[PDB]
Amino acid sequence: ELPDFFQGKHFFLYGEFPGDERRKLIRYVTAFNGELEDYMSDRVQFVITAQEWDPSFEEALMDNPSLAFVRPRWIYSCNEKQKLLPHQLYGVVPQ
Amino acid sequence: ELPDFFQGKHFFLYGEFPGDERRKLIRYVTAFNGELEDYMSDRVQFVITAQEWDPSFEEALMDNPSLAFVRPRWIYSCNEKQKLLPHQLYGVVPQA
């Protein structure tokens, strides 16, 4: 049956995604009981982005210290393993 | 009085640091009421490293999901600003 290891986690897909990769990311997050937000807020816990570190990311953190910025490969890898993998292995950082 | 914005936070300095950087990192963590762990454990919350991502980091995460891996510049920057800055601004991730 369908796994739900994303349960209780709020996602926000940020920026541009090629093709319909946004559609497939929405599907995997939804399938595993994650919750997608239409707008960025303090209720967001994971920002999924294919773009590199944005000056706005630091602004979002000043109100949401627990916020995590992760690559789309985290969602895929969680699907490959059918298991919640650490977001730290796919994080986005200012370099 | 001494500031204590590192209070309740457990650090672990991983790997080699050049010269005496390890001692000054220990100094700033200790001065601001942080606590160093001599070895990795469930108690560790922040792994400070200047080197590449280690294969052991992943195994530490499977028992400790909240683990954060940060660069030494985070310790300096919090000293420069005299305030706890977000670790995400100096985070470390696997490469290549």
Order of helices and strands of chain A: EHEEHEH
Total helix count of chain A?
3
Q: Helix- and strand-based class of chain A?
A: alpha/beta
Q: Assembly type of the shown chains?
A: homodimer
**Helix proportion of chain A:** 25-40%
The shape of chain A, in one word, is globular
Largest sheet of chain A, in brief, is: 4 strands, parallel
Integer tally of domains of chain A: 1
The overall strand count of chain A is 4
Strand content of chain A: 5-15%
User: First CA to last CA of chain A: what distance?
Assistant: 40 Å
Biggest sheet, spatial arrangement of strands of chain A = 2-1-3-4
The pair of chains with the biggest contact is: A-B, 16 and 16 residues
Radius of gyration of chain A: 13 Å
Could you characterize the architecture of this molecule?
Chain B: It comes from Homo sapiens. Chain B: Residues 1-92 form the BRCT domain. Chain B: This is DNA repair protein XRCC1. The structure is a homodimer. By secondary structure, chain A is α/β, with parallel strands linked by helices. The first copy, chain A, has a 4-stranded parallel β-sheet. In chain A, α2 links the parallel β3 and β4. The radius of gyration of chain A is 13 Å and the shape is globular. The longest helix of chain A is centred in the N-terminal third of the chain and has 11 residues, at 21-31. The N and C termini of chain A lie far apart (40 Å). Chain A has 3 helices and 4 strands.
